[model samples]
Target: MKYGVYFAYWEDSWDVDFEKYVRKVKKLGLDILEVAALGLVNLPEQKLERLKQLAEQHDIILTAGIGLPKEYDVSSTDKTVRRNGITFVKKVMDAMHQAGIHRIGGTVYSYWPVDYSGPFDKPAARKHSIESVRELAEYARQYNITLLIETLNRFEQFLLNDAEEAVAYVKEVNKPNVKVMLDTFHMNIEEDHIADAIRYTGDHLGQLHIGEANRKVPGKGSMPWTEIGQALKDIRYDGYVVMEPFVKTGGQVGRDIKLWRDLSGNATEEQLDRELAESLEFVKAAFG
Candidate 1:
């Protein structure tokens, strides 16, 4: 029921001077912030402390940071590569946990060193991914922290995308700690109805990544915002819906998937902030 936005968009607009943006974002009536694991300054300690102070001082809730490391793919069929991904998550999770972050997220599909093509044979891919996630879930549980997994639009992982698929994976694997994350942007592309997709995920729901219909900001995108709120309420779901406006990187599209073609319009940091505020309004209205 609480609302926030991923600070990844901050990377797009920030002058690397987070102090200014933190003041700006906190003023925008957004109290929760989800930070990108990349492009973070003063992370691991001093940086984290500042954010904590900002949140506490402003009554904001600073959530987890997103970590995306190269060669962090846990689904690699290769033993060595697979362990590397596992270790990466462990290290990142440990760091975040020490910082008192409740959850950490990564793409079910990540940037890899080799050609980790899409629609891979489900039989082999499933077993590999399931095992990898299960181990991660156990590790997270040991620390009493939650590790969230998100689905991307491309079915590259040949594993999780929709609510059913994600929850099914968690239940089938029977991991207590692993939770399904719903990314509205991806669901809008892959699901018939965003609400339906959310409803399907239900209690297995672990994390939320929401954006506007246009992939620009919350309200700027074509997402079914009103219905999304209804679905969450109907399911009695209690989770944070964090906005994910695309971050600008030299007018360049995301490197991994080349999904930069759909600009909708060239977005800047200021524009992104406004879009986020607008998107936040839509979610708030839906809850009404």
Candidate 2:
């Protein structure tokens, strides 16, 4: 598996100079750097090419992560909203293609941090999600991009909260470009056995997100990393294992991720880099 880190770990906003993170991750000995898809859509053409070139120069791979906002909820009951969502995803794919990013993982099938106050219609939402994703998968195939349906915990999302649901959803989509993405953070809350969940995902798993139960770097918190690594080996998952840690506690990123305290203990940029590098080493040793 290629170990990676999400760019958001250092930034407070979604949109930033991705070239900086590409260099940073490469220096930290990480093979991949995952950036937010929302930031890439409106990027200048020259800038997109520069970002792709920078990644190539450093021998680092780039991937994308997304959590669709309410307006872009493809599973919405409103047909207009659903249409907007599908169009927006295509735009994202176009950007990804330009930036040389082929793998995108997250709650692409539904919106994030769902509003429980609204009407809950599981069957209708699932139907719309599968239909929309099926079409998106067709579009993605042209770019050789894979759309990974991530399973979020109940509080964050209602659709596909576990491996069982995510696998079933991907099967329903029935497209080669659509696959399941499992995150250890969510599995810690919802799965009876995290390793078992990974095993169940098996060949259907496209990408894996690694973080602590409290959204810290892998080695800093109490998670069954050894067992989790073993499970990935058991499944022969030779895919991206990206760290999705959120430590800072301000800005849109911290707010959306629901981080109320500074998990890094006010670590400076240098300190944060060091910690992440050390965590990457831990992951390499454990996963190996």
Candidate 3:
């Protein structure tokens, strides 16, 4: 039931120095950092070294929360592109291993499977995803890292709507490195009982990404936390529960999100700091 947050590049609207942000987060007595791999890939070693030192200074654990770059789609209709995608993931995992962390997760299982309604490429998509993830999983296993397949919302990703689907993929792959992570935000949309999804993933569930019904901090939205907590206890899960809501509503962030201020209710950098702290306290207490 440990709690943490996804990385923020100074929360977009705030000019807080990145090191300062890490120090501030450390002050909260938390022990882990969840970074989006997309941003980390762009940083130079000098900058990344500073972050590594900061994590060590505070005794914090780091995990991967990366998105596959758009160009690396394993199920791409094109063979070269698909190979590129596989190569890209291997590179990302290799880099993550060098960075001193293992497990990495993405929107792979759910996002690719249900791309279209028709007869849908359900069988083909599922088969390809398993094969592709198995390759990545085996690669990760070599380094003792687990690759988590998460289910996203219909609007965000179509294929992985529930634990059953995630489990199916894991079972088919049969790779210890390939596990499932159930997120409550998307479960809010897809499951009748979010707790059931948690209970079902059980031991294979490597991570738990939490958000309110509307993807906001836990107590601020419509999620049923009591039930979620009970399910976690029932399942006896002993892993991290990281906070991962949209950087802004509708997947928008930075200046693009500013344009949707009226519609999306954007929060300022200071507000995000306050909200994360508040959310962390609320979630920790709930787990207790």
Candidate 3 lowest-lDDT run of ten: 255-264
Winner by TM-score: 2
Residue 118 C-alpha lDDT in model 2: 72
Per-candidate TM equals 0.83, 0.98, 0.86
Best by lDDT: 2
Where does candidate 3 stray beyond 4 Å?
9-21, 108-120, 247-266
How do the residues 55-135 of candidate 1 rate in per-residue lDDT, one tens digit apiece? 667776655644344466667666777788787777766655544456666563333222454434556657777888777
Error of 1 at 236 (Å): 1.4
- Candidate 2 stretches greater than 4 Å from native: none
> What is candidate 3's CA lDDT for residue 91?
75
**For model 2, what is the error of residue 182's alpha carbon versus the real structure, in angstroms, after optimal superposition?**
0.5
For candidate 2, lDDT tens digit of each residue in 85-193?
Answer: 9999999999999999999889888898798997879999999999999889989989999999999999999888889999988987889889899999999999999
Residues 69-92, candidate 3, lDDT per residue (tens digit)?
446766555567667878877777
Assess candidate 3 and give its TM-score to the true structure.
Answer: 0.86
lDDT of 3: 0.69
TM-score of predicted structure 1: 0.83
In angstroms, the error of model 1 at 13 is 9.9
Instruction: Flag the better candidate by TM-score, 1 or 2.
Output: 2
RMSD of each: 3.5, 0.8, 3.6
